[model samples]
Target: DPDTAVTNKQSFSTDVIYQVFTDRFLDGNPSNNPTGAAYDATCSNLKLYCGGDWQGLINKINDNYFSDLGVTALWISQPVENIFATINYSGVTNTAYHGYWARDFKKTNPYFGTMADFQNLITTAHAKGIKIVIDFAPNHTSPAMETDTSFAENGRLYDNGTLVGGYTNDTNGYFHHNGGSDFSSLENGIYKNLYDLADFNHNNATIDKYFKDAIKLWLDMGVDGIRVDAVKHMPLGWQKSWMSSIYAHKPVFTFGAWFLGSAASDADNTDFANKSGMSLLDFRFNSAVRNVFRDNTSNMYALDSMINSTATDYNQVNDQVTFIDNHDMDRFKTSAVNNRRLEQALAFTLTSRGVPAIYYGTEQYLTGNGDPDNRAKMPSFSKSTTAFNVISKLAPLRKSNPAIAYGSTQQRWINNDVYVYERKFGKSVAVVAVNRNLSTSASITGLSTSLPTGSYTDVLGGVLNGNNITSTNGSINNFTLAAGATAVWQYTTAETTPTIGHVGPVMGKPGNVVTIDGRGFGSTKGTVYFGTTAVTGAAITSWEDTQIKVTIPSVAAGNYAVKVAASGVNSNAYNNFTILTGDQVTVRFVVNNASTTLGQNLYLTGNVAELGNWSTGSTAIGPAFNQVIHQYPTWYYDVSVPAGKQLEFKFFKKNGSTITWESGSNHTFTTPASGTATVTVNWQ
Candidate 1:
């Protein structure tokens, strides 16, 4: 049991993830398929259910498909019960086959399987040394129309089959009706419905608590990780609050889907990835790879730029999930002519930084465009294909070579058509060379690697025309790379100096157990540090060369430089490691008679980081509250603050560059240790 037990579930850097669109994967149980208009038995109509279920996933797991592909994690579609109604949109009838439309979060989707089936899935997956990450779209319920209550389930939310609320009634203010977003502004998208999907009012106490409780259900069901949908559509602070609760209940690898355009720069997205408690899907990396490999709009220099800038942008680049395409976008394999593009992309991603995820059917060169098209049925599960073999050859390196999983990315040689990069962590090293040209070969020169002098065979064994490497004293010999080729060479050793590669769920309360993953962490128990405060003794749960589990010491609420000390040497510090003030509670702050002139608005700032640390620009809290229950001069904004902590804050009125502060001392209150609390104060 211990050998089969899922270990290091909090860290996924050493695993390759396979994304399975539940309905499109395999039809193991035809009996559970939806009938009539909602069914697409042949999978010709991509929108309808194609009969894939948990039983299907279980069948594949037992058949050794996942193990053969070297996939250690499976990120399946959302498993919650969705609305069964077949809604006709513009005369196109579609079912909840995608699993994004949730009618009940507490129960399993019967179309997917029963609760027992889900449990079996976890056990079967864990038994095969695979982790499961389920998609969770907490941003909204099923699609709804306010004017047409008869439309589908009217975005009605349920708790284990009990109807909680719907968009039609709007009595409890459970859903936002701010119209659809134009992809215009951040606030516009967050407060409005995403394409008529009734958006959950994350700021609402009831809705907020509902989601926090909902995620616990899945965690209790033994999910190893979570893939958060529409993360950009939700408030960053609110999601952080949810993450606080999630980590307190159970710590697992969590990442968000913050979609980004190809070569687009959004500081807000980067900021969220850093400050928010969760990591994110690496869209920038996806875009760069797609441009260079799939679309050919860019060159290797562009990809090199992306690789370096992203390392500086994200706090922990290793935690971000890297993928080429998913259910949302076009598959990486576009044309049948060049399977080399996908092969090289797969090799590049597997050896690159961060966790790699392969969308199902990618191995078979699945091709489609956008939404329903991209969500096509599995074409084939053959492991002999070039893409499949490429992944199979490289994915295992993440576990075997620490350099591939936790090393620093360095550019050894790069040109418009070819790129050679090296990954080094302590004594471990991996060098990858990729030539993108289909008709012309690239003469790779001036390539220097940390690999010792020796002749290294390409890991792919020239399957994609890759050649063996002849290294001369840590420098690679000049070699001509064939057109459309990818070569991988590496050398690994027992790291002597302690090195810290990544820390999971980076932000957590003191006393929370955090997983430190890297090499050179001695097998014998060692000391870990939170800034200057050292943690040892009972707090050090387990220590291995590649991993260490240590409980965070009780410390102040701020960023700390974290380092691990093993044997006699200390590891490099991972900066900006956040420490929170224990479990979070939703605190409703109400201000009465705080009158403001035209262009002036109310903002809150205080002693804690969550309160913006007395900074007004980052702490403006409201959709103004003038139209709601407590109306006009009475403004209230529900905030997620540290539980059981006495916090001091003050309300300020701002008009352009002018500022007006309250006359009296800072207002103070103690947040409840659990549940919710409200603080009512008058303008001083």
Candidate 2:
């Protein structure tokens, strides 16, 4: 039976995922090795075929390669059968061990292993508590050669007892090769042109059924998910329908490769993919991150801005897969800064929002410029490399904290030099600070102070401190982050509560302002309340243990309780307090003399001098004693006049308490106003 699948939902925001190219992983089967001019074992280039296979991965899985490094999931190359014979010879030299080429959808490539071997890999992976995602290609197929008579259109089928068509016109008529341009030639019989890879006609009903059945075969083999290849080239409607059919049979997760640069480029494709019940690779965000991390043209600000905008723009940004580098692109270390920069990149990729996927050996500081090198064998898992361990620790942290799992992200500060942001979920929050400079620090401000009060540890450096944090005091907290250094501080209530030394009025309008402060905020369990109402949006914008700055939701314009509840066996003290604002009017006080008649011209005043003028209009009322009224008085005057007469007056006050108002030593006034009569004034 299939191993019981783990229900733990891993998030790229907190967990590190690894990608392995089977051909480069390890070669355990020498008997299957191809000799002759077709397969060249001496090709030292990593891009050339290296003959890594399913058994190799199985060996690693049994050896605890992933578990040792805190790896939560593994993505392997497509296991389908590649071309049976050598056909096309391109000017550029490379081998087919990468598994992109496919000749038969029904069977596993003998080059890799049999169908049973593939099943064993999945079963073993699940037993280790690791999820397995297999590569799936739906676009084109490998070309057929003249010598491949086994399944050719006119050749004899080993089992079916049928004959198939050949590359040239044959009696069986099972194949029809298109003879047009490079793209259209696959439709005709011109397989000899491009690697002899046969491209299936997806529009054909028979072909469609074959493809679906192929997928169902793997799904039946106990694979958990599929990373669809060349999704953009296929008919979207077919993909959608195919995905729907596959998902109907099992609780499978689907991710597609609609490889495009910006979110806009693939927005429609991504939407269609998701609507069809599939997740999308975050190529848009990946490109933006790559530009900043690899190109060095942009900085953390660019990265943060892209992430925040993605969160705002996409409905399911969290479902999108995120990665620093992949097999198709140049290695991040070679194009980008190497050394700790790689570690920082990994930290940023794993700790930031979305599903984090690391290309093989990224944790071991793997370096390569382009394709073949990018496909190099994964390094041996060793204790000397703490990257895997760090990733492992972050996995549980991500699973436990909703902020890291499903939270909104906000960029608090960004520049060519530094980038800072927060991820918050419910009350859990985490602050991430990154410095792109080689050796410098950046000061960050406007953090939430509601985090618990105590010293907390930094996940990146493993340091504990209190003074490293600051409140919303507008005073900047200088982060001594090294070049390409990333720091994550989870907020904890036992540690330290961020203080609001200084704060200003909300700049724009009434809305929710969320602030997260305190160390361990990203990794801990805590409840946040905006006044009596709980603050539910959890994705850090800026964080430190000492301060968390959150925009309280627009309450009824008064004071409300901003409280935080803690979770865990420790039963930490709850942090609760009041947040005051002037958005709502809760009460109104009125002063009355009860002496004067309504219509009579009677002068009235009381002790509400501290209250300002009515906010409705610019009118000001004068004091009862001052007729010229340089200062407005808080008295209602009833003059004998017609009911339709308009009433107007100037308003002024002592601007002090009752004692000062009674003394009347100093005063302020307003300009005079003209009115017919019958004016009423109210004061407290």
Candidate 3:
């Protein structure tokens, strides 16, 4: 008895799915390879066949190929017994090794593997935390026997070769031959040719039971989902019924293979499929996204507008699986005007609104002209290229951050050149800025206000500041980003903790500077520390946030807590602190007065006391030395003024003609012996 399982409609937005063509993978058992008359079956040429089968997929699974790639699910070609004969097209024998052309609903493809091996593949994939989605051909069956003479003549075919009558007529005698070649004839003609793929008399009760039972077999064996082939050709009512029946047996997530082919009304199919409780691939979004990333036109507004419109236009946009190129379409790298732009396309797709799917070798920089070539062998694991690395990195980011996975997406800025958007959910926010130009920068504006008040590390590039990222209110929260670069900044309300490890100075000397390298540093909400003292104003260099280098602020000559707060929570006090030795503290000096009090000249002086090496050519005094300022101090600062009446004094440093003062010290009249008073200094 099959397991009575209920299909669960869990969200798919966070999954990283990988598609594989079984026959194109690897041939684990050479004995299964076709021979003699079947020599055409094992041909290596893509137009003919490759020796990949179910066992080969099992081999790849054992090798951890999918898991290492950060794949959450594996979508394989149909495993049903393929047409027993060779299918020739234009003098070329196109093998059914792909399993799309089914010959028997009850049997497994001998060319691929045995039923036990198929079950093993499913078991292995599940053990690795990988879900399995098998292909199902519900619209038609292969013509192992003569279709017209055998089934049709016996009145076993369904629909009676005409549109009238009930599903009971769906038996062999029901369907008509050569009705119409195109979809426009759906109302008047019958479909013929196309290799006698036995059209299902779907209206037939026996046929419906057979189809539903076949699906239950796999689901009972622990298959995670199903990919329905030729869904557009089937009646909408049939699909709803089929899916409902399958769901009753087991929780199934299904996608229909409806080729929209750049049609304007493609959304109609997309909508119908979703409404029927099955998700469909967004063929329109695929075309639009590919064009925008290919550098074909600078018009990114169209892409952004399309995303915005489709995400809400459809009821289940989250379920729409988005892809650049698939087994049926021309390979992206080969068809694209600019191949390097492939990386940008990938980055956008993985981080975009819909669920992203990767074809087998897309990460290996695979290219093909069409059909057969589109489905090629899985590149050896060692050959995993830089593209794979990019994908691996992106997969985890999407998994870890909900904003990128499932959130409200808004386009902050768009133009013919650049595009920028934000994915926000609760306290988590991610900013995606893209520069579509090859050699130029796409200046974007109107970003979200969730970014922090400092330099943000780019996921693809390095780092960006206010200059590279212009914010509206002089706050580093919003930004105007550069071209061809993408930035993802996630903000948390939790306390930030400092990572402890090898600390060094990013700029300036060693003793006078401090750099901490530890695990869990940078923008992540955590506590940070400088020795024993809690540190603020720390700048993040490069991070997985595990190893960060931070500068230590100048303290008044004593040990302090290097406590770092993380996730808005402070670290335990028991955590030890590292010691930092330094004499001259770098301080921004500012000057202010009790009143406007003009015509007052103040002279301020402080001893070097201790001197650390100054940054080269750094000025030592401020507000003018002898009324003439030369340079600024790298480690220390001083201020001087001409003798005058009722003059106040404060430590200030001179840069060019501007004099800046320190904020911590009090300003006092040069005369001394004055009562205690508070003075404010503005540091820049």
Candidate 4:
């Protein structure tokens, strides 16, 4: 059963994830360490390879380091082959030890392991009931200086072993030519390169196909999920198009990194997570939590406000990966003066909603500040630390208690120094109370919850000085929450009415299979709905009380709410299920002799939903078609459209809403079932 649970790629909402910086985790094979200047076996210099590899992870898996911590999933650094060159940033030299500076995506980094070692890592992790989620940075290749041809492989990209292009000599337009970004605007961030990294031109057919193919190779190799890096820097539409391709091939749980600094929230980040066919790392929650628990700059009310706001912000809030700190920031323990501070934060995160991630060394009280410092070689792998015990106690609750995994979060009680929240899904309920004051206690009254009337033990077992409590008629008896302590109480009852808790790979085209995970679906087959359209009989692939696999009905491409009906009872609807436009084929639309003013831009609109159903809003293609590839009056754009689709479209000019359509009937064409196509038209 644990093996089946680990292999379920449809959802990770019920699993606790461990984020590992590969080069910093451990060194099982010193022989694989980079030689000479590129290697720092001591890891005193943080930018070079330190010998951590897949074999190291496999050793830990066998040693039960993760299993004892209750980590059901591991998020490791990118495993792809990385640039071996060490380059200077100002005065400090760095290598691809972080794994972000990619050279070839299809090959394994020799510093990490050979291909055989990677396969063993996968096999070993699954046997121990752990899922593997690899970090993927599709936004760019390695770092380089455009003016210096000798700089760090010139950010050269490769296919297998053959060179495709480099920053200085990109003849195929494989990388963006725009200058470095100022980070002033979204358009500026997207179209331009990020610092010295060579930004991939997603608009180019070759670049688009390359990344898609690379990810599929990994998926085929049995990666359970993906953590997309630098998502905010890439075009949102381009990422969505790539996601369509991924889901079409093999649907997996995916989330992207959209970093938010301390006490910051972005509307764009929320919108992207909701509509991008994948969830995101919950930076908003992370910021609020760190401020309240570590920095002392914010209070519990701020944390409560984030809980309520994100509940509304994300459609599938449970899928949003939550964390207190990661490799990109100072370790949570660095600023946390008291060990109780770390314990309380760990408890709250494990019991809270959303998928939770713990940085590898957090349990051992690893302390560091900023990039390389925070990513220091893991100091110890102790299992007896208070933080380790706290995680071990609460992490399994995600698997045992549906409330903590799929329930809605509610603020039952709160104050400046204390916060009490309840998670409820159907008849399952979990209540958590946290007091942040280290030297003072709080009288916890008025704490009403859904927990049944009974005596309950603190899930932490007084590890952080938590105490037992009694609930009478759904009201917790008056008690004092000790300073810097966290208490968790839960109750679960058998479900009678059908309940739909989560849907996996939530985006797909018609006929693609998706798994529905929840409880109380009758053993017999039931009716599933995509919005209002009911799918039954042969469409339902397999039916079980807790899981069901069904084919997406032939419905128009759009977002829909999914639900189930069984034993004459209807289940709760899971919101924001997206139906895609099918497997995509890159179509290059080239328009010749199209005259335009300074502000006027040409757009491609059509009858199909992928072409925006002829809408002139954000769905229109004009603003994206500004690239002049060949000559003046010749504009072109590469669009990902549904393959094998017969569609009608035409070019239009827009100057502040004044529209000018090309003279003639709409141009009609049938897209190829695979590969790429080009449509060249002359504006009449």
Candidate 5:
């Protein structure tokens, strides 16, 4: 489990990140709470830090708070040491306790803990299968006296006549003097002005190296990812170089914070993803959600429309971090002002298209409205509540289902209060429906279903004592969702007809091949039809219950539909295939590990007639499963195959007229635009 926690892109794709403000979560060590810390933790002002420390989190972690909550990653507030004093705005004492104001980029506040505490946090999180994401700030630093070139010695001293602190060699050359974003010109735009934090020359080599070094050091310390704060404030070019450098050392998950509205154009967001080649926090979705769930001006469709529009807008919306509310916004629970609405919002975000990043205290139904109030001290886990149960119920669903994990969607049906949609990946299918009405049931009818005809159980489950209705021979009719309800339709097409689930290399040569994903082929010598021609035995190269690989029969240059027929049944036809002019070439396969003998040999036994006759019998085609002389101990083969197709096959040995399949799952692959492939494996 520890090995898998931080090792793959799937970790970010499928994970639910819980964003926590470390200073306000919990104070396990009361001594670090207020008086001794540079930041005010007296709780006299909500705008100030409430003294949550590293020990506080380690203690809670030991108590299994995150493990029980089922969050895979924790985005903790800034760990770098900050300005050693308070910044007063009117009568309010705002401190670096919030973490955005940083004086030292390379160290943690002693009040947070020693460096050892930081290492322990990372090690402990990984051991528990959790990933730690540091809240990284690279755009600016605290506007302490050291930042004011006109003040004190070397612009690094602040003797208010009563107190003196901070000593850095040369602080005058680190910042810009012009104000915050005067978009009319370049210089003013490059220099930004915040309430107190001074903007940096993001492109300067010295400033750039400092942030890069800070990030690299954190990565070395074992954090799994980074959530950059206020990225849109700085120019986009800085992100490209900074991210590129970090990736060279160790590529990890990183996303930007780009705040945009529902009606705002996506030109910027789209370019941000394409140009920077990274995902970002989704603020547009949040705005629409707040309108529907919080204001009650619209219904579930309000959010559904936004989800639908974004796929075409963002380069990769699936990887974007989505949430209903965060530290900068009003708390969802308070904004919605209704428990049912809050629950519906949480469910939609979790099961919908993007990765859910829920703010801490959301599951507890903690109702803090805006800014400082939104940063409440997290309550104990012992407060077993409805919100917690709802979240925990869906975590396993998202984790296990392939459709929920990676699926293309269609908004099947929509109305004011009820919204229904389905997501599909390969042949895996998942349908979700959410209803906003709390007093009456909402229903949908005649939904154009894509999944094969079958019965399905609710993954969102029965909202009101199992009354969420879903029916028909693949369409929604008389499907009534319980008031304040949600439903997820999970079905398998494994038992259905020979269905066409996938095809790659949509455009290829005359004898172009492609992969076909389907089910119910019944291991009965299926014949693949490419543009109405039952391809010759040599072309229908492979087959299986759920997949098949076939060559595009010598067809004309134009569009055509492809299908698979077996046991007197035909699969769904795909009409988007295009045939172009190009030469047919042989594809070579390079196999690794294990070989041939006098009594036995390896065979590519699959669901097709040419490969195995689906019997996996001795009568199968003979071709000694290629041998690359002296590849020693490694199963070596260069079995020549044609390009453009996918199939599921495994190496099986035939001994004394008996066939035995190797243990483990079937191996699958799809040829790319360039046909040749090299498969690496071993025979059991």
Candidate 6:
């Protein structure tokens, strides 16, 4: 039995999420500020604690600072006992105010208050129907330069387990290769130190158990969710263990924290989610929205790519947490002061796929660049700000619409300045348009909104009385987005004539319920066909004239043309629908043997990174080839790799470093959760 009542994942995906750095959230309880370390106002000096704590957060919730903004979920930093001491590393003073030091994993950080405060914060938030997500640090612990151990798991000391090191806390086995990782080789899964932070030994079973126990303790506090920090750095298998434990304890949502964003990167996240059964934060969406709104370096059209791409790559787009900016990145206001662009970013995030995790103080237009700067103290809640009003308007629209969560997104129109798209689920539709132009207004022409003929009002702002943006022959024609403006028009139903214009996703595995969207889809029994395969009955759950859902049957895996039949009629056969099959892995390596002599090439050979681990240890021809990848890398190889329980490989030069033998360590990558994957590398 949990101590607090918890709701379904709808709260996680359907509501506006607010993220707060406790030290910057509010000074609710000044009495519990760090006493051992003096507060240094110099951010350049790296001692940036401002006396913020749990009581401050509790006060914010109790006072409805979050609720008033229409945010339905709150995420905070780790609430663990830190070392609470200062250390000098690379000429900067580091403090535990950020809370990753974790002197005692089992107890709450005293600076944040007692365990009671944690309970109070969670309970209060739950009572308000707000979900709380906290950070879970499993990668490494505070650096211990001394042999005097501050924390222990199996034995007493981690230095040598029995015979301590010369001085620093001896906890050898507790960390990877004795707590120091190669800072240079981050992509390679090595036991390298993250600066001064000691890397945990994921290979150690007891160590893994201790962290799992600590995580279970946090879940027991009646918390609703968590985000795994530095998930990529941990062992690929650990996520399964930890996620299983948390789910077994409570049905709370969990997502791994990943930064760099792209179709490839999101594919990796989806791979992990598919493999580990854990959700992921949508850094892909975050990066795209930022690029679109920030400096216009990334085109507004890219946002649609994220929406459509993730839907194609991931099993559940709704589970992937979405955000424009977080404490880790520059604030949105810092990057782009245009309220219109910010509004556009917000509307896109809130109305698109996945749960939207809005960084704290975003409603106040918090502005800063990088680390401690982006982590500035949030201002007191102000109901009058434009950002706040935007949230106040958009959050409810998101919460009330299932199309925003479980629906499918169809990009109706896209341009560098004006972007218009539709989110549809069953009969509900949201036609959103945003303009990044500061002077010239942007208008989208011939965008079929797929809704009943009625004047639909802008849920965000404008024609609140169902504007006369009528649909012609079941397809909307145009939408004029003013300079620096965002409009989300939502409405219901239509047995309007349905035609096949676009089918999403363009590709998927068998059994995926492919969505067919166009015009003239009447509200009646409909017929959908892929090639000659007819999908009718309950398989087609939603059969609107303009849209229909058909589950791709387990036919011979391949791609086919999609068509819809309505009014006891057959719609046009259109759009390419693909039934993706098999494990498609692209392995490419450009052998960077600059020192090698001519005629000599590179060969890929290894189960792992080490040489002589090749499958054909004796007589088989070695997999060697030379091809140009780009301007550099004289030698390259590409091949389709099948799924493996695990995979490891490396590049070796036929010529020595001198000529017939210049050798290098193997380039490595982990075989991910599922679906085809790609691996590319440069010889070190």
Q: How well does each candidate superpose onto the true structure, as a TM-score?
A: 0.93, 0.63, 0.64, 0.92, 0.68, 0.69
lDDT tens digits, residue span 402-494, model 6: 566546788777777777778886566777777777787755566776776766667755621113366764577565666776777777543
Return whichever of 1 and 4 wins on TM-score. 1
Residue-by-residue lDDT tens digits, candidate 4, 218-319: 999899999999998886666877888888788899999987774455777877886667899988889888889888889999998888888877778888
Worst 10 residues of 3 by lDDT: 1-10
Each candidate: what lDDT?
Answer: 0.85, 0.52, 0.55, 0.85, 0.63, 0.62
- Which regions of candidate 2 are displaced past 4 Å? 1-15, 38-48, 91-94, 144-197, 262-267, 386-390, 463-483, 492-684
Rank candidates by TM-score, best first: 1, 4, 6, 5, 3, 2
Maximum-TM-score candidate: 1
Ranking by lDDT: 1, 4, 5, 6, 3, 2
485-590: candidate 1 lDDT, tens digit per residue: 8889989887787888778768888888888877777678889999999999899887777778889888877778989998878889988888887788777688
Better of 5 and 6 by TM-score: 6
Better of 4 and 6 by lDDT: 4
The per-candidate count of clashes, in order, stands at 0, 81, 71, 1, 9, 43
Off by over 4 Å in 6: 1-6, 9-11, 40-46, 146-172, 178-190, 261-270, 463-468, 477-479, 492-684
Q: Across residues 289-379, which tens digit of lDDT does each residue of candidate 5 receive?
A: 8888777766666677777777777645666788889988778876438887887788777777767888988888887867788887776
* Of candidates 4 and 2, the better by lDDT: 4
CA RMSD for every model?
3.1, 23.7, 29.1, 3.3, 19.5, 10.3
TM-score of model 6 vs. true structure: 0.69
In candidate 4 the C-alpha lDDT for residue 274 amounts to 68
Stretches of candidate 5 off by over 4 Å are 1-5, 9-11, 34-44, 144-172, 182-190, 451-454, 460-473, 492-684
